[PDB]
Amino acid sequence: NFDVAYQNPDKAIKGGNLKVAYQSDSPMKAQWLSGLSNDATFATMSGPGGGQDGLFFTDSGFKFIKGGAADVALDKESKTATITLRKDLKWSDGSEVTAKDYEFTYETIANPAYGSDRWTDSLANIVGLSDYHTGKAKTISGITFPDGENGKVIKVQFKEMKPGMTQSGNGYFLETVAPYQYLKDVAPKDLASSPKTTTKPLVTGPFKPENVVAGESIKYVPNPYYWGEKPKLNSITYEVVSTAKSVAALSSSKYDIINGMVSSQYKQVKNLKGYKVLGQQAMYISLMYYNLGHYDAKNSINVQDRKTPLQDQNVRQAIGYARNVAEVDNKFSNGLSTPANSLIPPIFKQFTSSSVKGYEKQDLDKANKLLDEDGWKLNKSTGYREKDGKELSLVYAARVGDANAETIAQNYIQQWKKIGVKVSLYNGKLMEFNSWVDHMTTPPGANDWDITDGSWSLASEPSQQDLFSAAAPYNFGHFNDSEITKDLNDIDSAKSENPTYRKAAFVKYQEDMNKKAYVIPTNFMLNYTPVNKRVVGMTLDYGAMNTWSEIGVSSAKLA
Structure with a gap:
């Protein structure tokens, strides 16, 4: 009895500002680099920004498809994964995303000087990754660039192939990029607290964060350099909201979307007018x-x-x-x-x-x-x-x-x-x-x-x-x-x-x-999202790769 998407009768206006909240009783911890990030709240909030610069699209089944920021190809014989970044994949400052940027992600997780919690033993399967991780090796031998560092192609060499490698979230290889030219001179002990990874990052998504207020909110504006479909909205504001205040905010039409609402609240949200409640497994x-x-x-x-x-x-x-x-x-x-x-x-x-x-x-x-x-x-x-x-x-x-x-x-x-x-x-x-x-x-x-x-x-x-x-x-x-x-x-x-x-x-x-x-x-579980009736194009379909660009409003005034 849940719908994946809200099919709005009214059409979208051009422009608009969308208001989204995430229900959390603890503060947002803003870290734009995937390796350095340990806060789930911020990670969802990073979504309009590109989700901490995730490369790959998937199908509804989470299997990789070719249409995203990059594409990944697996060759069993050579035991290799090939990542090809788009010709015009760029950072929010207009700078080119390069093979080096993808490699840098590995350094941020693998090199202990950065302080990442995200190393897995799965990464040991990549040739030379452990030796880099232990400081035995200066470089990562398993990672190479066919057209060089400034190039668009990365080759990743594994000890053994795994069938899960056609699924996003396999862990065998990484799915994000880090802006190397931007962060290059930041000392590694400093990277996580740097403004460059917190309040003033570079991102690859359809929106870029114009303003970040620590622990609370992000103001998103269109990223001019986005490879993809230009967004309908002029802006999106994303804020932390308390569990205690969420129902009231919906009641007063404060937010178009609130994310992360717990199950116990649902009956309270169920009949509210002006909202459609979406559900996904x-x-x-x-x-x-x-x-x-x-x-x-x-x-x-x-x-x-x-x-x-x-x-x-x-x-x-x-x-x-x-x-x-x-x-x-x-x-x-x-x-x-x-x-x-x-x-x-x-x-x-x-x-x-x-x-x-x-x-x-x-x-x-x-x-x-x-x-x-x-x-x-x-x-x-x-x-x-x-x-x-x-x-x-x-x-x-x-x-x-x-x-x-x-x-x-x-x-x-x-x-x-x-x-x-x-x-x-x-x-x-x-x-x-x-x-x-x-x-x-x-x-x-x-x-x-x-x-x-x-x-x-x-x-x-x-x-x-x-x-x-x-x-x-x-x-x-x-x-x-x-x-x-x-x-x-x-x-x-x-x-x-x-x-x-x-x-x-x-x-x-x-x-x-x-x-x-x-x-x-x-049990299986369903998650629900209240959506204001003004919203155009909202869906929880796992197959939809361009919702942030697609998303619109029928009017300035919340329903």
Whole structure:
């Protein structure tokens, strides 16, 4: 019941100023360089500016297409990625974006003198990148310029190809440029605090930031040198707004668009006149974990050696079958949570299918039967199942604070009683989030919990490697399955270069995970954006690459 786009009946005027806010209770931290930026709020806010100078367009599935600021070509044989910047891709000062600018991005992340948090071990796969990163090498041998530094072409040499490389957000190579000629004489220790990367940057986008007020706002004006379609709007103002003030701002028609509004507010925004509420499915999964083991950090491996009745597959399935997720979503979520059939949400068109079945539908009868056939026999006197004299009783580490978190956890606990399973909260209450993070992340892992809830935001390349592999630290339940490992290797294989083969691999892995049920998919999520009725051309379609240029207003006066 959500629309991706607002189809405005009235046509756009020429010009106009658009007013956008981002809901945050903490201040904007303005850093125009991608490597130096650690604030999510600013990063969304940077969008009219080019999103910290992102090079590549994608399709709706997040697969790279050729029409953006640059294009990227992969040759498997030479183990190379070729980046070609547009002939007239330029910085906001009219200066040419060059091959060197793309290379400089690597230096900002890779060279420790800059202080970036964004190095990944994935970058080690690029030839010579580690040696540069460790200071062994002055340069990055893996990166070359066929037409030189002032040229438009960059070659990137990898040790190994990965199939995810056709997806944006792969991590194997970087997608941004840094204005080298501009920042060249800034000492690296200074770059992050420099005016040149904060209040007075150079950008590649359809708009450039005319004024930046620290912690609060940006004023955007058209970038004359933008390669692309010239924007309709004269300007856009983008401001931080508090959670507390957001509903009122919409009520008073202060903003055309507010971004980042939380789910609990939605009913308040739902009927407001003068606005249309847009919804889009998030790159998000929420899921249920079983505690099956521990993590061996020295050897970097999960060992599934925990003593639990959760070791039984029937037991894992039954507990999943028992939950009323769809029903819980219907009562409390307001339609922002929709039951997950799989670990990957359907917006990843090429990595999943509706055909996959999980635990989206409650089956109390199936759950009871599974337990019966596995020797877990109900004691009439108590209401709970036993095997070999031992009660089937578990500890549930539920956590704060999705909306209605106490209510939801209790609901599940009751469904479990229906199946003869005794479930209690960890220490009698909800875990606070920071505490939960420590409890899950800190090796070797705790033995005092059986069931927990977790969630992830999935990248444009929705890699399972950091989440569910044998070698992963964040594999919270510590499962280790040969079939699952085989499935994960297959996804990342040379065969997976073929998209049809890769889709089937992703699909197989999702099915095997559901059947094994080491973890159970809980929810998909929707994000909503209120849009003032004056707005022309607004859409949340993931396929749309030119919304900032496209975007318009029917009139000066907000609806």
